[model samples]
Target: PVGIEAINVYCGETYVDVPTLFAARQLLMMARKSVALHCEDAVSFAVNAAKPIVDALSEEERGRIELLIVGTESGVDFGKSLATYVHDHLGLPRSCRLFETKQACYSGTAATQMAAAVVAASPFDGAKALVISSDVARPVPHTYVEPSQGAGAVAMLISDQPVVASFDRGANGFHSYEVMDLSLLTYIDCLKSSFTDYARKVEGADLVDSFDLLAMHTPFPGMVKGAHRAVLRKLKRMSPQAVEDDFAARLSAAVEYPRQVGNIYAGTVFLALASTIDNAVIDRERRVGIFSYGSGCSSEFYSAVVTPESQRAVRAMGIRQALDDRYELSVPEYDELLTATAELKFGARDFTFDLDRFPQITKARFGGGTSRPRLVLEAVRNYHREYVWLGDG
Candidate 1:
């Protein structure tokens, strides 16, 4: 708390400093939820970004989600990709790239770029890619720490034409600097130099226009604030309005929210950023900024242009409505929601979901029924199309 910046900006109000709050609200509209075999955190992000658009897709059009990339810094196997296991469990295409990306929170971005490149390079009829960002951040207990723990996931797709958004162009917009390293340096020095370069690059990019809004890897208020200030000095060079670091702070109100939920690692930053953009009433063509920091961490400071281009997709779903529809929890309540997952046995009880919110993306132990279930199901499939685990008798 001592390092807390004096006379700082928060929640659109000015405060002397801020602490990493112990409890917070984690709310976002996602495409899927959790079962015994899945985590709410696991499906939140991907679902928020994408839903089961495949339900409407034709058998030939669905071509089976070709690549399922479950990239995460946390691996469930030794030299084994969780994507492959997920592919089998989810029943995706036989030939596909199922893999994970490590390096802390950077894996999601790594997967994002990877998917875009793969789908663009290969021409397939109905190829699809799923990118999910899931994590839980623990900062320890006793002083605004433990209760802050949080978990959730977001999944997206890359298809013939994305339902709403497009990521074909991922060029770095405004950058402070880019420094590469070879075999001649110590690991620590490499990191130090990289950050140093980031500081400089931020200062350098200030020559460009300040973003209409931006995103950052903010596990703590200090880190996010400090990075914003460093970039502000540079942005001030381009526009006097951006010279005030507080302006950047305004767009970052969502940063502290995760402090209560703890560090969802790769997800904390992106979720906060997306939330901010959703709330901001800025113009569509406004340029938005993004600062991606990977551990040891490779930090890429870039800007994304927000115009009618970005707005069109957002308008499809009322952003605020979706985020608000989620169920919130208290400290003890959140702890109860935390559960690990295991495989569905060859035979098990026939699981069923009654609520409309309960759309089973996939089930464990599929195939082998006297009556086969369709690859996809409508919101109200016939009773015959209902789900029944193979082992369930």
Candidate 2:
């Protein structure tokens, strides 16, 4: 029963309304997308999400986390692994393996699967692995991508405990190919093939009968809905009404958070999974079908089991409250942030963050004398990053 023992997310402290951004640019959109502050990047996002999970563990329990894997499309250096920064900030054991995984958005699933295998194979008793998926948008403003592109992270503790969701060992289907274009067509094709391969591996698996809920990597809610429709049309050949009913029953909960936060790339699939656990009714044990896709491209169809305890564990994270607390940035402020973030490009050396740049947002986050201080990027010197705790840390 190897799976996630705990899970948490950090969606930064600010966001911009997608509709407003669209109106400001003379287009249209929905909900809002989180923005990484000037003082937040992939490292800070990863550490902030994982810190509480680590802090909950006993020292002996923490030492059992022998592997730390960070999945990101937002790498700072080609040579340096993002996992090192996350491990350092989390105070993980010195003896642990630290590394990064990249496959566009599939990196998070790759990291999670690798960590699960390692922990399951470890010779040590009570072995555990920490998997963090974090990414920040690369500023493709004014484009359609800008409205949906988002910044945030999701962190998980992988162990045999399986308190959140338990993976069905060997129940995986994979499809990969070389695709130069990233479009909805490619995604739909991959979705069909991956689930086909999955059905072949697990006998008697029905698209409509095997899982209680579905969580797919969401580029956006509409995209996920399209993929789901395509898969059901191919596999079950159901009427449009039946497909809509099934989707409403199995997938609507999964897309709730993603619609609000936009896309977090590598972490988006798990974010969907988190949304499912938090929003769905799980009075008894249930199975979940998960599909993850990344552009480049690669995909997998996998299954996990969740129970009442899984719902309880995920709900306790207060994900809804965190999303509610973010400062809603106006269109001009969002544009200013876009300009400000451009300065902290990849491979920059010796730059100090002006935390006071957004004084109002800064004060709201760090001025309340709060005990659960948040991590923020302080500076980068000689191409090395530095971070500090804000509030009452």
Candidate 3:
């Protein structure tokens, strides 16, 4: 009974419409993407996402969180792990283990699996682990990746409770190989090989019949579609129409959040999972097949079980409402943000976030004074980062 007990996400307080961004660049794209503000980075996103989940826990439950793992490629310092900052801000027990996991987009799943195993093996009763995947994309303006390079974090509490989804223990498979660069070909290769390995491990597993829903690490909606198509063809030899129907029925719900928020790097797959639980109609106990891939490169195929209770728990987080509340930034304003964020590069000695620079967005997120205080990076001095909470405490 070890898996995600609770989950929440923080996609920041602003975004740029992907269509508008592409139109500005003379291209085309999808809905909108959540973007990290100058005052928001991996640490802020991680804290914000985990805060609500932590706040709701009883003191004994909070103390039971014996490990904290942050998976990210967006490391602010070479020597420091993001987990330290996140742990401090979240006020986790000092006895907990804290570290970061790195494996490109696969990092989050790596953290989650490790946390699951640790909590499952813990000698203490009610032991838990906090797993967070957080990232802020580097400014890659004007490139095709720019439109999809959004930012955010997903936080999951893993323990024996398994209220959200229960991992199918020992029912996992993995595939890995070296690749100099990422491509559609590599993704497809890993997708097929990993699932094949999974099928081998879990007896009688079928491509289309074993699971009620499916979630994959989504670089984008089209990529996910292609991967799903490749797997269906390899395993079931499904026709185009059949593959389309399968995707529409089982995979579409998983991509809804990724399409809206773009790629949050390490967290993208779990975001897909969160999206699936929140959007899909889970009338009874259902199984979900998940595939995770990381670019330099590793992959795993795994399964989890979710019930109607899972849907109720995830929906209460208001993930959709948070996405809707994000202030839509015009192209010019987005460009201005890029310029403002450029100075706050990695390993800066001293800097202060100018919240006043975007008064409109700041006011929108924090000025009204509300109960949910948003965490923002306040300053960095002598290589130490400082954070502040905005809005009413």
Residue range 109-207, candidate 1, lDDT tens digits? 667566666676665554566665655332233444233334444455555464333331534422223334331122223223433444464553432
TM-score of each: 0.58, 0.97, 0.97
The 0-to-1 C-alpha lDDT of every candidate, in the order given, reads 0.42, 0.89, 0.89
Question: What is the alpha-carbon lDDT for the whole of candidate 3?
Answer: 0.89
Per-residue C-alpha lDDT of model 3 across residues 272-322, encoded as one tens digit per residue: 999999989999999999999899799999999999999999999999998
In terms of lDDT, which candidate is stronger, 1 or 3? Answer: 3
Model 2, residue 200: distance off in Å is 1.1
User: Compared with the true structure, what per-residue lDDT tens digits does model 2 show for residues 167-280?
Assistant: 999989998898873478878888888888999999998877999999999999989888788878987789999999998999999988888899999999999999999999
The 10-residue segment of model 3 with minimum total lDDT is 364-373
Report how far residue 35 has shifted in candidate 3, in Å: 1.0
Candidate 1 error regions (>4 Å): 1-61, 88-91, 123-128, 137-140, 143-148, 159-170, 173-210, 234-250, 253-262, 315-328, 334-393
Residue pairs with backbone atoms closer than 3 Å in model 3 (clashes)? none
* Model 2 local distance difference test score: 0.89
lDDT of 1: 0.42
